[model samples]
Target: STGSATTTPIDSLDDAYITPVQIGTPAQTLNLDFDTGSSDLWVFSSETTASEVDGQTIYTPSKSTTAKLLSGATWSISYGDGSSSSGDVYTDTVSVGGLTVTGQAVESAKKVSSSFTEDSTIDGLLGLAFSTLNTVSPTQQKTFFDNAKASLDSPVFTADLGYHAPGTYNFGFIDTTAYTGSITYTAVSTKQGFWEWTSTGYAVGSGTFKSTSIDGIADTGTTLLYLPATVVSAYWAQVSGAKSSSSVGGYVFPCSATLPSFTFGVGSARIVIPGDYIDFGPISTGSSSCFGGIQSSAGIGINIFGDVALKAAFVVFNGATTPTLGFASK
Candidate 1:
């Protein structure tokens, strides 16, 4: 894989695949993560065991009478956070906005945590990212997008994500409200999925930090935009009291006051990272604070554009045989 200057390969990373889409009414509905990084749409069924797993969201099939459990197959989902849950497999008619795919496979976990159990207000994740990382083994099932294509009415799907601003994650459709004039097109690549990207350069605010540009990796597996220490320090200078947290993970500062907005210079685009993305919360020690957007990986090797940073712009995930990623405005 070449550095961030030249993309290694779309299929080389995991961000270019999968997208999250909505279904039914919020009162009795489910929102799948729609990741092609793996196949199979898994949700937490109401039948899940009460054992809690931090940040894990549980889906209740009982809420939807139409939801059917596979009954025989056992199910379990594990994340890098050392979190895991057990449940059963099910297939039912799952709906995405106006499009509905009947007998779509899903997961029903019984155990969960506050992140998934309490904070994650959605039903479940839609794994439309890729077949390689699919939770479903034997890899025969088609992803949510694969089935949605026939019912999609359109061949393209777009996602607009906001780490701080209002972000919309769309599927089977692309919204071009933010772009000016005509939309520019980039050829798609046949690589792995999950917001995978290669950039021309990296920047902060109005300043260009091209000289400090490091090879970047767009990782959906990661949750925050992890940057190198040199870049973190440069970004901290713009903040009031930005300092390392160590215990909390990265840097900390007093976020109660007005925070400065930072941007990533991605070639022609200057993507802004919201202030809220930096303030984790006030800490007990000296009322310590944390950064929400860009952070120091403490030399974690590579930089990652996690969900927080991803929600800022429109991300297009194309899974045709060539599979490519598109970043435009909505």
Candidate 2:
């Protein structure tokens, strides 16, 4: 397992930024962010203006051993974070783990302002979340998995979020040894394909959260989950006096507490978010008190089940089978 990779376990598969696919050839490999928030595998291309591509990770086609650019297709993406970019369309030979997936969908944007570009290690984002939020939609939109699945060994992808540094988003095969065979599959009804949800909620302790009802979604681009105000207050209520503090855009709490035992009720499959995960890192508050796994989403009417949830469960997306979501522990 030295060279091989593993899926990142936070709570769900929504927050992982997986690796791209191609053969033995590795381009300036990009960090594939699976966003239930959106769907698309965007990359940088030659069409980008020299000024627009500034500070952005540029993927040179000539440098890769295997890479392709679609002749005439063009694309542009405006993320929820308010940054936007656009460029040409193309197909590339992307490699992840030990598999080589060819002609996988790729977006080459000339202009991108997402904070993602600041890091030299991150090249682009792989949106595996949903089709509704795709910037290329209403034109020629498709999920990254849907397009790349044909070339994969099993119509499956394993997102491993490990390594704390520049290599945090490395890809590899799923290690079955880390999973609990109990995957709960839930049907997805897309009144909006991007807004699909199931009746699964999580409770950290016995009297911690009376309402075991919480919304779950699959997004890889986001680093953490966003819980609604009521759920946030309910969960934080157990922390005694935990309040909203300036800490990476989430509520900060005393990390030293037993924290709490988070249990996710996905139909019959119960996934647990341990206490260690709650104490993420040193808070912006400057105190040793950091954060628990759960964070407040303010009152956005939207809650995102980001990477924090995916890391603790082995998620299986059944797009071809039942339009449902399945989860096991990995």
Candidate 3:
């Protein structure tokens, strides 16, 4: 009960990171996206129409002796990118890495949107957000981390996401071996069901650091780094030949362009994102054009320190009293 569990990332579209998790008594394994942005351990299930489900694995609650329907409960959720899922609820044992939560709520998807169905690699989502954000009807659900915290050595978890490389999610304990440099701490405001924090300001490349406060969330499920339109414009302005491409849906630049470094303020400490990280991936399958990993959060209305930003550093999600976030170089 005092031990920690670490799950490695699985191969996925340059969109999200998935990890293996065990559900129910006999331990049906599934690859799940550990999302810090939302709360719900929902998976594609037997309830999902066969035609609607692609090559993704579906959880069959009936196959597990410990799985029990929550009778009247149901859940539905939509993401900022328009991905959605809905399902009935079941109570069963859930395990991640090595930690186990008995009678944890598991939402089984009866229906999913095209975004989810099309991404066949992602089998489910394991929400790491506060339980208050859970969407289960009649009664709210606790996340796997929340349900297992009482028995954990420390009420904390660390997300060591990598750039198109394998990463690990360590629960119940912070592995100092996974990071370098001192971990800078920041208080988190959970008013919006996110690990939201106020960044003091930022700088472009070796340019002067400007004092501009930005409020944003640390969302691992999101792919790119989304900043305010003004900030995004300023950053791209420094990149020669960079422009907002209507065809690409965001800023695109010549793959050969020497992008500058982007640094964000975490109190007095700076978390600098390398120039290469800002180049995201190629705009098309085999094109020399690349999309800017940093984009405008215009439509979204909130800045997101997504995988592009988070992968640059080691992050800690502290769930103890006075919840706080800690970061360091990997």
Candidate 4:
């Protein structure tokens, strides 16, 4: 009842958890995003327009003996700023590490947006969100996690994301050695098919822990951590030569500037993020200034603990009848 998968950074930056999965009869492999924010097992395929193919790998259903088209099932998926794609559905045998599921809905892209064509790192997305978030029409499709949930030993999964390094996604059982100390538990409400939770408070380095309720989602697909304006405003002060840059759309400072570690409380557990880890890289190649990884969620009205925050701790997405989340320092 245990499954394991490796997660590598999409690019030089730890933007997403790019994973490799096996699909079809002979097990065609493709790179995909293990996106916890969405729920669709979509992929670029032979049905896609040749012009839409950039550096992506496509899944050819026709070549697979086990592939079967699902009659009357179609899906259209879109994201912020016009990154969209759509196509019909096909049932195929798909495998992720030690986990394999037959008759899984594998949506194929017939057409794609310019943004999708240009970003060639990922062929498609492997959603870990609840099936309620699925875009498949006629009948909503189930996510891999949902399909595997019935057979999972504990009906839970663990994520251990690393800064600029490969990490892990373990299904069923939590690996004790992956983290240090005991994990602190917190309730999770999948209000909108997201692993949503409210953090107790936060502390700046060794500073006092501010008692504030911050609601956010654990999003592996997102690149940065977003918090309340007041929180980031305080973080802005502890830095030297750091200023909000209008051009970069966030704070920036000297590459060599010292950064204080960021810590947030969850279920009475404090996870510390190294200051240098949040200094997201340079403004440009060879540039002396760098962009900040922490931003305000005020504009979006939804805080997100993305890769920047995820890399700091070992996370457990516990899917009991009453769902919960566990965090442990590594």
Q: By lDDT, is 3 or 4 better?
A: 4
- lDDT by residue (tens digit), candidate 1, 46-150: 566555533334455565566665656665557544555555666666555546666666766666545566534344566655545555433345566676666
The global C-alpha lDDT for each of the candidates, from Candidate 1 onward, is: 0.53, 0.58, 0.87, 0.88
Name the regions of candidate 2 deviating beyond 4 angstroms.
1-20, 23-28, 45-57, 62-72, 151-154, 160-176, 208-213, 246-249, 288-292
Per-residue CA lDDT of candidate 3, range 232-253, in tens? 9999999988999987899999
Candidate 4 CA-lDDT value: 0.88
The CA lDDT at 41 in model 2 is: 72
The ten-residue window of minimal lDDT in model 2 covers 163-172
Each candidate structure's TM-score, on Cα atoms with residue i matched to residue i, is: 0.73, 0.77, 0.96, 0.96
Q: Judged by TM-score relative to the true structure, which candidate is superior, 2 or 4?
A: 4
C-alpha RMSD for every candidate: 8.0, 4.8, 1.6, 1.4
* Per-residue C-alpha lDDT of model 4 across residues 1-330, encoded as one tens digit per residue: 778999898777776667899999999999888888789989999999999999999999999999999999999988633488899999999988878888999999999898778879889989887789999999999998888888888899888997889999999999999999999989888887899999999988778999889999888877888999899989878888888887888888789988898999896789999987788889889999988989878777689998889889999988888888899999
